[PDB]
Amino acid sequence: DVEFDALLGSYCNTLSLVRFLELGLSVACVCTKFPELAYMNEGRVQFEV
Amino acid sequence: ARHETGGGVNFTLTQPRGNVDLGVGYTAVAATGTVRNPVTDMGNLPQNF
Amino acid sequence: RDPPGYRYAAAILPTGSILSTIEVASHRRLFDFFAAVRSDENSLY
Amino acid sequence: NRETLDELESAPQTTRVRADLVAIGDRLVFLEALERRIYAATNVPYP
């Protein structure tokens, strides 16, 4: 007698790493890289219309 | 940060972020399109005090 | 008052372009701080 | 893991044949009638 088991194949996907600038929503927002929010207390913005 | 459970070690990551309603008035209106489900069945239950 | 008001003194040091214009006072219940242009202010000098 | 695990082997041979292709959206699809082709006079009813 011969009786064996067969792993006939293996499949995988990939985590499609979307990039936020490669995206239609990107002109809604000036996304700014400011690494110093941790030591920051507060910011303000004044407006002169 | 690190948490170090009895079940294993953990590594959580956070980030400070800021956003501003930079527009002086009424950016980004929205509107309703369709109904798609009438979730509640509309009535025929008494109120019981 | 002035930690909002210094921002209007910082708005006196301007870089920031405001794109579309409507009446500000309709959105009075939106801002954190409102100042009103009335032709002059004895404080801003 | 950026793995080359699944398959890339041999690039098999290609041959032309009569068929039909429609464009329903950007998914381009065959068409097949399976009555006059193979179940012509066969006493098995078409599925």
What is the experimental method?
cryo-EM
Rounded CA-CA distance D42/A11 in Å is 40
Residues 12-41 of A with CB under 8 A from B: 28-29, 34, 37-38
Q: What's this structure's resolution in Å?
A: 4.5
Cβ-Cβ pairs closer than 8 A, A with D, add up to 7
- The answer to whether C9 touches C35, Cβ cutoff 8 Å, is no
Task: Examine chains D and B and say if they touch (3+ CB pairs below 8 A).
Answer: no
User: DSSP string of A1-49?
Assistant: -------------------TTSSTTSTT------TTSTT----------
Strand pairing report for D27-30 and D21-24? antiparallel
With helix as H, strand as E and coil as C, how does D1-47 read? CCCCCCCCCCCCCCCCCCCCEEEECCEEEECCCCCCCCCCCCCCCCC
Residue reference for tokens 């509640």: B40
**Which chain A residue shows the shortest CA-CA distance from B22?**
A45
Token pair of D46 as six digits: 């078409």
Closest by Cα among B22, A31, A45 to C9: A45
The alpha carbon of residue A29 and the mean position of all alpha carbons in its chain are separated, in whole angstroms, by 16
Asked if A10 and D6 come within 8 Å (Cβ–Cβ), the reply is yes
Rounded CA-CA distance C3/A8 in Å is 70
Closest by Cα among A29, C29, A31, C5 to B25: C29
Residue reference for tokens 């959580």: B12
Query: Strand, helix or coil at B11?
Result: strand
